Amino acid sequence: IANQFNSAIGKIQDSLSSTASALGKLQDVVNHNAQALNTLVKQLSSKFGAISSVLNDILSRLDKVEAEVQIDRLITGRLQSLQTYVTQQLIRAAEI
Amino acid sequence: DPLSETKCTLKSFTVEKGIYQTSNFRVQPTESIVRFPNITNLCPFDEVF
Amino acid sequence: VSMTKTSVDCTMYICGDSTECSNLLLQYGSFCTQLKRALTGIAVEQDKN
Amino acid sequence: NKCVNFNFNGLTGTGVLTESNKKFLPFQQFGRDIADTTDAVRDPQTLEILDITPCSFGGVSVITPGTNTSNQVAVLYQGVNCTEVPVAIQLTPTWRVYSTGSNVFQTRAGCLIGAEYVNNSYECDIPIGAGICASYQTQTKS
Amino acid sequence: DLFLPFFSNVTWFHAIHVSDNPVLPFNDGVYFASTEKSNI
Amino acid sequence: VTLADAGFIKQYGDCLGDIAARDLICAQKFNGLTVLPPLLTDEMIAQY
Amino acid sequence: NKSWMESEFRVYSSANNCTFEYVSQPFLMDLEGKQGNFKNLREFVFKNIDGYFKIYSKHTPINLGRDLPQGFSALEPLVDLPIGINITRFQTLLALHRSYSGWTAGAAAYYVGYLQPRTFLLKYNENGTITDAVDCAL
Ligand SMILES: *[C@@H]1O[C@H](CO)[C@@H](O[C@@H]2O[C@H](CO)[C@@H](O[C@H]3O[C@H](CO)[C@@H](O)[C@H](O)[C@@H]3O)[C@H](O)[C@H]2NC(C)=O)[C@H](O)[C@H]1NC(C)=O
Ligand SMILES: *[C@@H]1O[C@H](CO)[C@@H](O[C@@H]2O[C@H](CO)[C@@H](O)[C@H](O)[C@H]2NC(C)=O)[C@H](O)[C@H]1NC(C)=O
Ligand SMILES: *[C@@H]1O[C@H](CO)[C@@H](O[C@@H]2O[C@H](CO)[C@@H](O)[C@H](O)[C@H]2NC(C)=O)[C@H](O)[C@H]1NC(C)=O
Ligand SMILES: *[C@@H]1O[C@H](CO)[C@@H](O)[C@H](O)[C@H]1NC(C)=O
Ligand SMILES: *[C@@H]1O[C@H](CO)[C@@H](O)[C@H](O)[C@H]1NC(C)=O
Ligand SMILES: *[C@@H]1O[C@H](CO)[C@@H](O)[C@H](O)[C@H]1NC(C)=O
């Protein structure tokens, strides 16, 4: 019973050393927290209907009366992007 | 003070024992730096107008 | 058992440090504090789990 | 190496400027990142390439006992090296007085200010991160 | 954008004086390429 | 498990130059997305 | 005149109303130093789009390994011409150097491929050159 247990726990070294994929259930947590934040930082490139997605171009090129009407398109789409991320994170957190 | 910052963040004149988020610190700029090309001469607008 | 504890400064993600965008963001009320609160609710749970 | 309101060819921003290792071809004026913001620029008076990065910043968390127990508090600068908070001596938090420090301590979670580090462990009273916690009591070991 | 598609047909013309050629179209745009030397 | 950002100190001298051009974790940080450390280190979890 | 020069221009018999003119130095002359039976493949792209005629180009050193090689390269922008005219067709100039009314018989060869509106994914290396790409419709 000792030689069986000692040789069985020996195969755990190989079951972990030999394949790459053994811890996929934990790697998937890291991959989803990375891909969600990498998505969220790409959403800053979306124009949401404004003349530029770069907020300093709006503020370089326009005065207050129509600069604010362009900025508010980006406030709206960015805020929706956060609202999507925080809803997705609350949905995953309740599964973890 | 940072306590007064948390009192406004909680909207309360009493704060209980804990750790609380507050507005980011951000090193603000010391001066402007304007770098156009050092072009010498006025454009020909005064001919076409 | 846990996931990466994350916090976001919504007034810095939404507005690239410009004051005039920060003044438009106040037109939306408490949305930015709800985002902070919900992410804090997740982040304090990871250390519970 | 200093925080400035830069403007290159009309492209206003706020950041620090540094010499790039990047190698723009003669047709390129601006270099760019995943958020389509300008990451680098070619200085039009000398054709030098400058990296642009935002001036140093981070989250700030405040650690307090019960306000009925005391008004004194400690402050944690998130992800920040304690060589950098003395450079954060304008800034967004106008309560500069916490920079007086003397009890500054580096956690891996951030630079922690206004709390004195002590070797003898306790139960976790207020959680900081990365194995640290903070509490309000008299050490009076001596 | 207007690109040349991968693995697409391109017309390889030889041209010679000897000591017949119609005008080519220009629809969307043209990738034009040569290996010919001596600035002929 | 090849972890991405444990949350430990990012002393700015890391971020400027080459690394922010290829590593997304700095671009996240420069946009106010912040990843915090756990309360219990991998040494304290191993001790329990 | 003791010189090699275009003694007459056959190409246009008339030039009746001309509306833009230019002089330059690029358009991909030759390599420096030469090598025995080594050659340079010259690539150009001509794009006409809402009244601008745009040119891009590339030099490619290539050996005795056939032609038009299955490796990779990308064209740099060359000029943006504000011409405002309809292009529907094109032709290319040969220049047989008249050696003895003489017209000694030159020979030449070139490749033509019409562009299309298309979506591409482009790989920029850590130096910022495009080093690979994929056609999202191939
Ligand atoms: C119950 O199952 C056991 C295996 O799971 C088995 O143990 C094994 O027994 C055999 C012999 O019957 C051993 O085999 C070796 O025996 C000698 C060398 O010692 C050689 O002649 C053989 O070729 C072979 O190498 C195994 O070493 C042994 N394994 C362990 C871990 O002890 C038991 O015999 C089974 N018990 C019953 C009651 O059936
Ligand atoms: C905070 O920043 C300083 C640099 O300003 C870091 O100091 C360097 O640390 C390494 C590793 O110990 C040494 O090899 C260097 O010689 C140090 N340079 C200087 C100028 O002191 C310091 O390590 C950082 N602290 C943290 C916690 O990351
Ligand atoms: C294109 O060329 C023709 C020929 O020079 C120009 O036509 C002349 O226009 C003037 C002014 O109307 C008349 O006096 C001449 O009698 C015209 N000549 C002919 C042969 O038609 C024409 O104007 C030019 N186009 C432009 C836009 O300048
Ligand atoms: C600007 O002046 C400098 C000398 O101060 C000179 O080297 C440079 O060539 C000038 N810029 C341009 C666009 O020529
Ligand atoms: C922690 O203990 C060491 C001795 O093991 C001592 O040198 C050090 O000063 C102590 N830390 C503090 C903050 O005093
Ligand atoms: C390529 O050209 C040949 C004729 O030379 C033709 O048979 C073939 O079908 C063409 N293929 C495509 C995809 O254009």
Per residue, what are the HEC states of G23-55? Answer: CCCCCCCCCCCCCCCCEEEEEEEEEEECCEEEE
Helix axes A64-93, A24-42, angle to 10 degrees: 170
Q: Which of A65, A76, A72 is nearest to A43 (CA)?
A: A76
Q: Which of D95, E11, D86, A58 is nearest to C24 (CA)?
A: A58
E strands, G39-106, where?
A: 39-49, 52-62, 76-81, 89-90
Q: Identify the sign of the CA torsion B37, B39, B44, B49.
A: positive
Residue holding tokens 């509306």?
G19
Please tell me the distance from the alpha carbon of residue C3 to that of residue F38, in angstroms, as a whole number. 9
Please tell me the distance from the alpha carbon of residue G135 to that of residue G122, in angstroms, as a whole number. 9
Please calculate the CA angle B31-B36-B39 and round it to the nearest 5 degrees. Answer: 140
Q: What is the DSSP string of A41-66?
A: HHGGG--TTSS-SSHHHHHHH--HHH
- Chain A hits for C18, CB-CB cut-off 8 Å, are 55-56, 59
Q: Are strands B31-35 and D3-8 parallel, antiparallel or unpaired?
A: parallel
What is the CB neighbour count within 10 angstroms for residue G60? 15
Among B21, B23, B26, beta carbon nearest to C17: B26
Closest ligand by atom to E12 CA: 6
Q: Which of D115, D67, D113 is nearest to B4 (CA)?
A: D67
Q: If DSSP codes are grouped into helix, strand and coil, which group holds residue E24?
A: strand
Please tell me the distance from the alpha carbon of residue G115 to that of residue B46, in angstroms, as a whole number. 42
Q: Identify the sign of the CA torsion D57, D59, D65, D70.
A: positive
Q: Using alpha carbons only, how large is chain G's radius of gyration in Å?
A: 19
* Residue G40, burial from CB neighbour count under 10 angstroms (0-12, 13-18, 19+): middle
Closest ligand by atom to E5 CA: 6
Ligand 1 center to residue F35 CA distance, Å? 54
Q: Identify the sign of the CA torsion A27, F45, F28, B23.
A: positive
Please tell me the distance from the alpha carbon of residue G82 to that of residue G77, in angstroms, as a whole number. 15
The answer to whether G45 touches G113, Cβ cutoff 8 Å, is no
**Residues with Cβ within 8 Å of residue G81, at least 6 apart in sequence:** G20, G22, G52, G53, G54, G55
Interface test with F, best of D49, D51, D61 (most F CBs within 10 A): D51
Q: DSSP letter at G113?
A: E
Q: DSSP letter at A89?
A: H
Cβ distance D25 to G127 less than 8 Å, yes or no, reads no
The finding on whether B38 has its CB within 6 A of some atom of ligand 4 is yes
Please tell me the distance from the alpha carbon of residue F21 to that of residue F24, in angstroms, as a whole number. 8
Residue holding tokens 């591409």?
G120
Q: Which of D38, F25, F14 is nearest to A38 (CA)?
A: F25
The finding on whether G24 has its CB within 6 A of some atom of ligand 3 is no
Residue holding tokens 């008076």?
D45
Q: What is the DSSP string of F1-48?
A: ---S-------STTTTTTHHHH-HHHHHHHTTEEEPPPSS-HHHHHH-
Q: What is the DSSP string of D92-129?
A: S---GGGGG-SS-EEETTEEEES----SS----SEEEE
Resolution (A): 3.1
Residue F43 structure tokens: 């040494």
Q: Which of C10, D60, C1 is nearest to A84 (CA)?
A: C10
G window 34-63, beta carbon within 8 A of E: 39-49, 62
Note whether A touches D: 3 CB pairs or more under 8 A.
yes
Residue E13 structure tokens: 């013309």
Cα(first)–Cα(last) distance of chain G, in Å?
Answer: 56
Q: Using alpha carbons only, how large is chain B's radius of gyration in Å?
A: 26
Ligand 5 center to residue G27 CA distance, Å? 72
Quick one: residue D25, left, alpha or beta (phi over 0 = left, psi -120 to 50 = alpha)? beta
What is the interface size between C and D, counted as CB pairs within 8 Å? 8
Q: If DSSP codes are grouped into helix, strand and coil, which group holds residue D60?
A: strand
- Chain B hits for D76, CB-CB cut-off 8 Å, are 19
Please tell me the distance from the alpha carbon of residue A69 to that of residue C24, in angstroms, as a whole number. 10
